């Protein structure tokens with residue numbers, strides 16, 4: 001629902017800034033930039049919500065042809081000015097009890113990661129759907145740092 | 147003959163023009179061309195003089211090869227015994243006060259001199275022996291090092307432990323950037339390692355860094371201090387030549403001692419095996435050093451590169467490690483080699499994860515203890531790199547590097563760091 005909510009303003013603007021992901025359409029490319037500059041893109045329940053939302057927007061937006069996932073410039077003193085892709089699950093939150101089995105560990109595997117493979121299942125609301133019930137697009141990954 | 151008179155005439159014209167002309171940067175194109183033409187006429191005669199007169203010159207300065215003079219002593223003594231052949235201590239002091247852009251390049255004259263000396267089959271090897279002798283600073287500090295197993299210097303911390311000379315390069319603020327003082331400390335420490343009979347193997351490693359980007363991380367070397375080079379603080383003789391003829395050559399061949407111990411008839415030099423451990427990266431002169439060790443270790447995340455001046459003796463040695471193609475890739479085209487890619491084995495024996503590096507370093511220091519290793523490393527080095535080979539290279543290096551030190555493209559790029 002969040003992605004459907006934000007789709008009109010993304011088709012028009014070509015830009016969405018979220019807490020953990022900045023999404024930009026440019027030259028037909030959905031540029032997802034993981035932008036948790038303070039923690040090297042450590043993952044949590046919010047990051048998955050933004051990732052799934054962004055991936056959906058890339059897939060349902062007809063002006064996007066290829067996707068791109070890349071880590072943004074970091075602000076932490078050891079990495080200031082340098083991009084870092086991902087440092088994995090937020091271990092602090094995990095210890096503190098903030099990592100949900102359903103809303104994180106299961107949500108990410110069945111949702112946006114599975115949509116990277118198989119695309120988004122739409123309604124029967126466009127031509128083709130008989131052969132392509134899902135909209136899928138190719139994805140490029142660029143790993144800076146690690 | 148006639149060449150000394152023509153030389154003295156040409157140097158007189160140069161000092162006459164320098165007295166009357168404006169300062170560097172206030173000269174006109176017509177003026178800049180007059181002084182450049184005077185320099186060219188003078189230096190051409192310095193070459194012609196020494197092509198025939200090098201041996202006589204060196205013999206006067208060294209009592210027909212009866213006195214071993216180091217480089218600094220040699221060029222200074224040459225200036226006072228042969229005015230205009232090489233700059234005086236005074237002329238060099240003025241040069242040193244200027245940024246590289248504004249210098250006249252008097253050091254090139256030293257490049258000419260050292261080339262002619264090293265080209266001589268008689269004087270050449272004699273000067274290389276002089277530079278293999280222990281430095282006076284080390285002879286000074288040796289008893290206290292024998293007694294305390296520790297010496298702290300500005301750029302190098304030395305510690306004897308378990309029979310190992312541990313050199314730790316500890317310029318925490320600048321990634322171990324090299325300068326004239328580092329060479330004084332590096333040569334001094336190497337001497338102490340070699341002359342201390344309680345030392346059997348040496349170890350070179352970079353200390354923990356303090357700069358915010360690397361705080362808590364060891365880094366081997368980031369090469370020459372480019373800031374100092376731009377500012378005019380890199381001495382052709384006291385840095386570029388001293389390091390190649392001093393501590394780097396002593397890593398290969400050891401220190402030439404007096405005939406003051408048994409064995410000297412078969413072993414006039416004391417040499418020992420050396421181990422290097424590269425944390426972070428080895429750039430420039432740091433990467434150059436790796437071509438001279440008996441064991442080299444590196445952490446998985448390190449890289450090696452030689453990044454416009456000649457990279458010391460890398461042009462001499464890289465071909466023997468990596469062949470003609472890769473060595474041009476590294477030197478001419480700035481290829482960077484990563485510890486974990488296959489061809490790093492051309493330069494590195496072990497590549498280990500940082501969490502396993504410390505123990506891996508320790509194990510290597512126990513494996514080079516024999517007198518057999520000493521006999522073997524001597525025969526290996528002799529075959530790898532001959533006396534003629536090294537001397538032939540360093541002779542030409544003296545001039546080629548001298549010119550590169552003062553090229554317009556070098557001065558420009560070094561000032562942009």
Ligand SMILES: CC(C)(COP(=O)(O)OP(=O)(O)OC[C@H]1O[C@@H](n2cnc3c(N)ncnc32)[C@H](O)[C@@H]1OP(=O)(O)O)[C@@H](O)C(=O)NCCC(=O)NCCNC(=O)Cc1cc(O)cc(O)c1
Pocket residue numbers: 319320321323324357359368369370371372373374386429430431432453455456457458459
């Ligand atoms: C080391 C790096 C790759 C790391 O990237 P960063 O961490 O982003 O870099 P920096 O912030 O510059 O590095 C941190 C820190 O070290 C300082 N540093 C590192 N190397 C140097 C040198 N060489 N000079 C001065 N300061 C230096 C740098 O200035 C920073 O301090 P601040 O001035 O306080 O900011 C980078 O700094 C870099 O590219 N440095 C230049 C490396 C270089 O070109 N070295 C020398 C190249 N050429 C030779 O040595 C040639 C040579 C040497 C010889 O000995 C003999 C010979 O015949 C020829």
